[PDB]
Amino acid sequence: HGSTTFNIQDGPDFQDRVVNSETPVVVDFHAQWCGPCKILGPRLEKMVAKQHGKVVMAKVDIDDHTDLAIEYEVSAVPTVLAMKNGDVVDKFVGIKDEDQLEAFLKKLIG
Amino acid sequence: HGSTTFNIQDGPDFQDRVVNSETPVVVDFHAQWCGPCKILGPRLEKMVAKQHGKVVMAKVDIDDHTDLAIEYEVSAVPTVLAMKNGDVVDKFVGIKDEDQLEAFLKKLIG
Numbered sequence: 001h002g003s004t005t006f007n008i009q010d011g012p013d014f015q016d017r018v019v020n021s022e023t024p025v026v027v028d029f030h031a032q033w034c035g036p037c038k039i040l041g042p043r044l045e046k047m048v049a050k051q052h053g054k055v056v057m058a059k060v061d062i063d064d065h066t067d068l069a070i071e072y073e074v075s076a077v078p079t080v081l082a083m084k085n086g087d088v089v090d091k092f093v094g095i096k097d098e099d100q101l102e103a104f105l106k107k108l109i110g
Numbered sequence: 111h112g113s114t115t116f117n118i119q120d121g122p123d124f125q126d127r128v129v130n131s132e133t134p135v136v137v138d139f140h141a142q143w144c145g146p147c148k149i150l151g152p153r154l155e156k157m158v159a160k161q162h163g164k165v166v167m168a169k170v171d172i173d174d175h176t177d178l179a180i181e182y183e184v185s186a187v188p189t190v191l192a193m194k195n196g197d198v199v200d201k202f203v204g205i206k207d208e209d210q211l212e213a214f215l216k217k218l219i220g
Contacts, residue, residue, distance in 0.1 A: 031179075062143070073143075076186055
């Protein structure tokens with residue numbers, strides 16, 4: 001559990017690493033068929049990594065974990081949710097650039 | 111099978127019932143998390159049924175067919191591809207009303 005960026009493995013994993021997270025979390029719902037996801041994912045991953053634990057990034061492949069997509073009412077990908085204390089606190093859909101992501105993260109982190 | 115409307119189960123089933131179809135095929139990419147698909151899928155499936163074999167409908171659960179969404183560059187649902195002798199000949203994304211679907215089918219069937 002050393003990495004601030006990680007693939008969600010299953011329901012349990014989500015509940016532990018995300019719902020029960022002591023730090024703010026960005027949840028990236030993505031799939032291999034989603035082109036914009038292929039740019040956004042790594043861009044967000046890099047920016048989260050640089051925060052060294054002030055925020056974590058939980059990646060959820062909606063093919064592998066379609067239940068989590070249903071639960072969180074995903075309607076397209078990429079969808080990124082900001083979560084804190086188990087609640088959804090912010091959300092965007094689609095690609096964002098580095099400036100936009102940086103703003104998103106600072107708002108979440110404080 | 112006897113039905114003009116069906117679920118694609120796997121890769122071979124797509125080769126047999128779509129790529130090797132002797133009739134024109136409408137291929138409906140949907141997902142369990144997609145609200146609009148709940149409207150479109152049934153609407154289209156009924157209209158297809160009514161043609162009693164002049165066209166067939168291959169339903170593709172995107173999340174069970176990453177491969178096919180990759181191949182046909184499906185990045186959202188619903189997406190519907192019209193296909194004939196192995197190739198894409200028309201496409202739409204999102205819901206369509208009955209008039210629209212009629213036109214789409216007439217254009218494909220002739």
